Design an enzyme around this catalytic site. Sequence first.
Site, PDB file in Angstrom:
ATOM      1  N   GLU A 153       3.477   2.692   2.711  1.00 58.55           N
ATOM      2  CA  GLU A 153       2.068   2.598   2.937  1.00 58.55           C
ATOM      3  C   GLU A 153       1.602   1.723   3.969  1.00 58.55           C
ATOM      4  O   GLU A 153       0.637   1.922   4.899  1.00 58.55           O
ATOM      5  CB  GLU A 153       1.494   1.743   1.357  1.00 58.55           C
ATOM      6  CG  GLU A 153       0.009   2.014   1.146  1.00 58.55           C
ATOM      7  CD  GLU A 153      -0.454   1.419  -0.014  1.00 58.55           C
ATOM      8  OE1 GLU A 153      -1.880   1.183   0.118  1.00 58.55           O
ATOM      9  OE2 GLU A 153       0.091   1.116  -0.828  1.00 58.55           O
TER      10      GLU A 153
HETATM   11 MG   LIG Z   1      -5.854   2.119  -0.477  1.00 54.44          MG
END
Ligand SMILES: [Mg+2]
Lengths: 594, 596
Positions: A203
């Site tokens: 991420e």
């Molecule tokens: Mg997010």
Amino acid sequence: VDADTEKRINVGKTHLQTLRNLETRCHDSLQALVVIDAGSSSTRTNVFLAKTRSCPNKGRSIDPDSIQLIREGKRFTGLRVVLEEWLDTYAGKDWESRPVDARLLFQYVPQMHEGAKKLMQLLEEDTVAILDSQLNEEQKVQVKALGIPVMLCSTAGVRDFHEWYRDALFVLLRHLINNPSPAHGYKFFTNPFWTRPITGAEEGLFAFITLNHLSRRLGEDPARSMIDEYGVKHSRNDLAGVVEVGGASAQIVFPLQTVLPSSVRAVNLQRERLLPERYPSADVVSVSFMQLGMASSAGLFLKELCSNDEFLQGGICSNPCLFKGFQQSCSAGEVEVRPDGSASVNEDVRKNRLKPLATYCSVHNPEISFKVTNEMQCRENSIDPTKPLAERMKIENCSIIEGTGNFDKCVSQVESILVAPKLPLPANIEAASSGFESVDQVFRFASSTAPMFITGRGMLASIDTLKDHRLLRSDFSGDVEELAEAAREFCSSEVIIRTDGPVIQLPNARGEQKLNSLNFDLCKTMALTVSLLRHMAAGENQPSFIKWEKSIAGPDGKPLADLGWQVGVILHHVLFTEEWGRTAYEAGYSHNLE
Amino acid sequence: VDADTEKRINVGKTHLQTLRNLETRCHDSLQALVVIDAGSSSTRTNVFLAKTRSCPNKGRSIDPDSIQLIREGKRFTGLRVVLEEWLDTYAGKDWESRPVDARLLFQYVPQMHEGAKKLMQLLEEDTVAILDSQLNEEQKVQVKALGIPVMLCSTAGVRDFHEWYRDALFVLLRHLINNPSPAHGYKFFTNPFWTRPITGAEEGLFAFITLNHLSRRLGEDPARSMIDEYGVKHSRNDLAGVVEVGGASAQIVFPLQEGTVLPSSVRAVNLQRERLLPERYPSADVVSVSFMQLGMASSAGLFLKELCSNDEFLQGGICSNPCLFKGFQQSCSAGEVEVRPDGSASVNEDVRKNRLKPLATYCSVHNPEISFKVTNEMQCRENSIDPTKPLAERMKIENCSIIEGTGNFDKCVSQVESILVAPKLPLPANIEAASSGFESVDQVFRFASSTAPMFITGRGMLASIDTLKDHRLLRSDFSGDVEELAEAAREFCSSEVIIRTDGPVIQLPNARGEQKLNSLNFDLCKTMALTVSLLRHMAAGENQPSFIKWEKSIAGPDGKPLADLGWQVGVILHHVLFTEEWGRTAYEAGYSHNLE
Ligand SMILES: [Mg+2]
Ligand SMILES: Nc1ncnc2c1ncn2[C@@H]1O[C@H](COP(=O)(O)NP(=O)(O)O)[C@@H](O)[C@H]1O
Ligand SMILES: [Mg+2]
């Protein structure tokens, strides 16, 4: 006529040469790419457009610089709610407080499919509506013929989800994506590489790829890179790092300019297959912290602060991160600052900011029951995993929370509770495995001269608020003392309830602003910023510069896409030319023909 | 204390970074590459050096711009002589005049190996001597460790060889190359892709690749090419064409320009499609045609035979040659000529040294190419060679005792045109040219033409222009002007042969000066006539070259030429440029493919 007929000879000869050129050259076509953000608070579609090029005997590829966001869709049900609703119906209500035989839940897989179907139909309808409204006829023909790759990725919302539930849900989500309505003619398709949960580190890496791509720092061409006399490709400009603070987690990502302790695990972009070999190499620290997001830290901070006898006395919790004159019911439930100045605390369990943590922190979760380590992390944040959900979320012997507007006490508490806790904050095995237990350890074991970008709505609102009141200069570059003095002044404001509602009245007749549901606790975020800046400032290497950015402007002065992991995940796939050609074009949507 | 130790810490940190650098960077190493030119007159080695680069996870490749010729070796025996000697011994003497059962020759394959061995040992000794003399000890370590690829290619000399003999010889040549003397430590190796006969069209294509590479017209980087909005790579500068006149054949090569109209009978080559250049290089459609009997030696023999069998030139045993100087006289034969110190010209009687031997050997009724094909027999008979007669009478210029020079340039041009450039039938052994749509030189510019600049190459072609430049008959900036060349050559070729104390001399007609008469310039006027004829044919084309240049050599980046013009650099490039294939054959298999 031997000059007139001669021009006719050249017309005919041109017609053949033009046709010959058409069959030798490359041809450009438009493709739609879909990224489904399966976030902590919601599931939203992100519709992108990209230019593909096909060359004779070379196949088809995407021009990465052509990637543009056309629209971010509606906020639909989060994946956590889908799973928790299915558990409420099939494991029974209050499964958070009782032992559940996970093996028995296998008989309810079709029912999980039906729940997932409801959400998928709304997302498909939304995606199709965006496509229908933005594209013209000629564009639709191209978009419909090429196929539409779908990348549904889940983040912090279901990252800490227990048992096998989430991974079974992903198998169902992919099957749903691979069977779109035939009526609209858009050929959506996915596979286990595009649609999957992403780690906190991934991420962060993807948001780092997005930032550097959009800002033109990352590239393989002569404009963005340089090959030295030893054949090594270097980026022409320094690659920047990123701090992204979302709803549930916070990512800290930076390239190393180094010599690292054996305990710290840095990622090599090429070796770890994030970027192809033709791109400049980089060793990147990427670490994600659960409970550091806006919503999740708010719940955890209240629970920990209001359980300390220095802050809790005779039913009153004195919160230094909240304004003087501000009062709320003693709970981590969602706050709505009403027109009358009152703070309405939502008592619905699903809306309580402690629900995800209290759900994780349960003796009926194998991660707690078998691991003392995890149990102690929970108990260190005043959550007793042995108690029912309602008492795990409850702030004991506390009726009311009152703001004291004391910024330094707020910084001190944010540091001890969130930034530098005694034990790692729960559900952080990934950060710990990479060598970082907490935020304070990140800049102690690894530091870089790489410039840094601070992202996240709340992080930006913290700086922009102080800029608007002329408490901070418009050219603020990260000065710790400048930020602390500005926030100390702003956070000592009195909350006045006027005819026009709750108002933040700044000291020294510096003006005012309206108190609302987004800014009532902004001082905690300013304290988080101050603490983070002090930790970066203490590192052996210090960033060349620190920038707060809402967006990055494209070549035409207008941003082509948003900051975040979405562009990065696309790039991570499309940049590997051969693999992308095979999966997106050779197999394609036709892989689903049944 | 802290300032001084911080520096000491920085030395330790540097020591690590220097080593990290070493294990991350590309590393350069020197490699030797050998091209054996198995031409018509001789077999000679060509030793090259190139810089190889190995990068982590990318393998090894050659920097094509680093290719430099270190030395062209000694002129050893041609492959034709090796084979004809073998035939003399195993098929018997005068096999050129009798029917030979080729099937029976299979029992003499080990003997062909022994003959080939003698030549291979001389070439290996020559190659090793060049390497030992040019390299230092650090360079030898690199050169010895990497392996030395060998590319032995045959051209016009054995192109027209009869039966299966030549291809059996190639199998033996490769085996010999793959087994070098272990003593010298140089690891020479080849395979059927590197060592083989090359067609005249390939030969021309390779010389075209050499020219454009050295002159920096051909390239794949931003300096030499540009990618358009439609992803097509174009060369930044016009690719030039080449005319190469060797000892036995002449090659005519030119790229075709935009919107070029080709008849279906004319077969042009696409460099990428025909796998001459990799995809990453700019594309080009190239006309490449080679003509047997157009080389210096082969056209000299054929021209004498044809001219001196013509009644307009042969009278009372004297053949009047307009391509030879006034006062020049020789024995009426196509035998090799030697201009002696006394001014006399001695014609060599040895059949192997006669410039008609290759043609008269080809033109035999005992060659299946003649006996089964009337077409080929008629081509032979058109050049006064009766294939039914013994070798000695096929090579003989009948009822002719003496050749006398008349120094008449226009008559010379006229004859070069009718005999060599525009004959009634194609000159023998030219099925390849004919198959690509061109029977003769005159047809090349009629059927195809280009605005592509042209380079004229060959020892004789350059001597023709340089001679006229030296006597100030042509300007130093000569750009191809036909009338200027014809006017200059007409004057030079009307020169008289004067026999002086210091030896024979070429005396220019109007006190313009003089030069020594020798074995290399006695018949230079035939080459000037060939040039004039060729220029007139190019001038008649629908599209004319942007410019015409005569070049001996092409200068490198340091002002000095890196290699010679010809097919040698081109053949190297044709293999080294295909990165993956080259890595597999040169480095993965390598010389170790030969390990016992
Ligand atoms: Mg997010
Ligand atoms: N104007 C604002 N001021 C302060 N905080 C703001 C804001 N707008 C949004 N936020 C914060 O960003 C968060 C939005 O979450 P997302 O960025 O959607 N992260 P996720 O759902 O993908 O995990 C909310 O938790 C909210 O508190
Ligand atoms: Mg040659």
